[PDB]
Amino acid sequence: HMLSFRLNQVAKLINNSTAIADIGTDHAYLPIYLVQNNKTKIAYACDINQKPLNIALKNVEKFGLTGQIFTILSNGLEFVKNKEILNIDYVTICGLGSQTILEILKNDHQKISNYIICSNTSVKNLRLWAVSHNYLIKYESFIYEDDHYYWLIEINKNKYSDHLEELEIEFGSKQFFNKNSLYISYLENEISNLTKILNQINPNNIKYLEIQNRINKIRKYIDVIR
Numbered sequence: 001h002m003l004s005f006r007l008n009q010v011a012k013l014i015n016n017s018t019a020i021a022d023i024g025t026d027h028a029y030l031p032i033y034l035v036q037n038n039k040t041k042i043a044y045a046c047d048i049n050q051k052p053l054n055i056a057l058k059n060v061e062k063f064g065l066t067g068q069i070f071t072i073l074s075n076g077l078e079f080v081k082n083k084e085i086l087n088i089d090y091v092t093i094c095g096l097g098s099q100t101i102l103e104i105l106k107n108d109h110q111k112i113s114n115y116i117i118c119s120n121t122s123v124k125n126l127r128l129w130a131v132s133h134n135y136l137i138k139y140e141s142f143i144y145e146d147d148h149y150y151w152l153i154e155i156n157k158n159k160y161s162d163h164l165e166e167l168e169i170e171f172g173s174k175q176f177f178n179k180n181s182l183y184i185s186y187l188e189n190e191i192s193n194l195t196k197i198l199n200q201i202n203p204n205n206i207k208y209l210e211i212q213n214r215i216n217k218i219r220k221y222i223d224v225i226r
């Protein structure tokens with residue numbers, strides 16, 4: 001297979017689409033896969049760096065897809081303003097951190113209907129974004145691959161945000177993580193790392209209080225999904 005496990009997880013969520021845009025597409029293997037399997041009719045394969053975009057175009061050529069996949073050089077979503085970009089069913093953003101991803105989302109556009117994001121940092125700020133704009137978080141899951149964790153979140157802009165509890169905003173809608181031994185294991189390991197820090201910094205530092213509260217928030221959330 002041409003996709004890593006986490007990229008296949010993104011591809012399962014995409015079907016019967018007219019146009020998708022892969023932000024940070026690198027070598028465009030996800031757009032290529034999606035077009036080859038008739039999940040999308042066309043794809044925009046976008047990158048901020050021209051260098052991997054050159055490899056992407058060659059890849060598109062070697063599979064005979066230049067009429068269906070189009071390389072775009074762009075910082076995030078700046079290109080979507082343009083008049084030749086069609087309405088986009090799904091924008092996918094994979095393999096970036098939440099901070100970078102949230103900044104890209106500042107240029108969210110009415111042409112875009114859904115996001116699938118695969119962040120390599122926890123996505124509390126992306127869930128806050130969805131909630132504060134009243135977008136549905138349609139799907140979340142938690143992925144381990146190549147000695148790294150990944151946070152997958154699907155946002156449907158045409159449906160209302162669920163009324164997430166504050167612990168859910170922090171760690172994920174219970175719906176998607178109930179009984180999830182992988183994620184619970186990760187969160188217990190987060191408590192261990194925080195405990196190490198509590199045995200090193202001064203209890204009068206404000207960080208001690210904040211870290212003590214983080215631990216208790218995690219333990220509460222663990223107890224709910226356990």
Ligand SMILES: Nc1ncnc2c1ncn2[C@@H]1O[C@H](CSCC[C@H](N)C(=O)O)[C@@H](O)[C@H]1O
Pocket residue numbers: 007023024025026027046047048049052074075076094095096100104
């Ligand atoms: N602000 C930005 N806008 C568009 N692309 C960006 C970007 N910042 C980083 N990138 C690109 O995003 C890619 C991250 S590597 C991710 C590759 C692939 N999408 C995957 O998930 O496996 C790099 O190619 C980098 O050039």
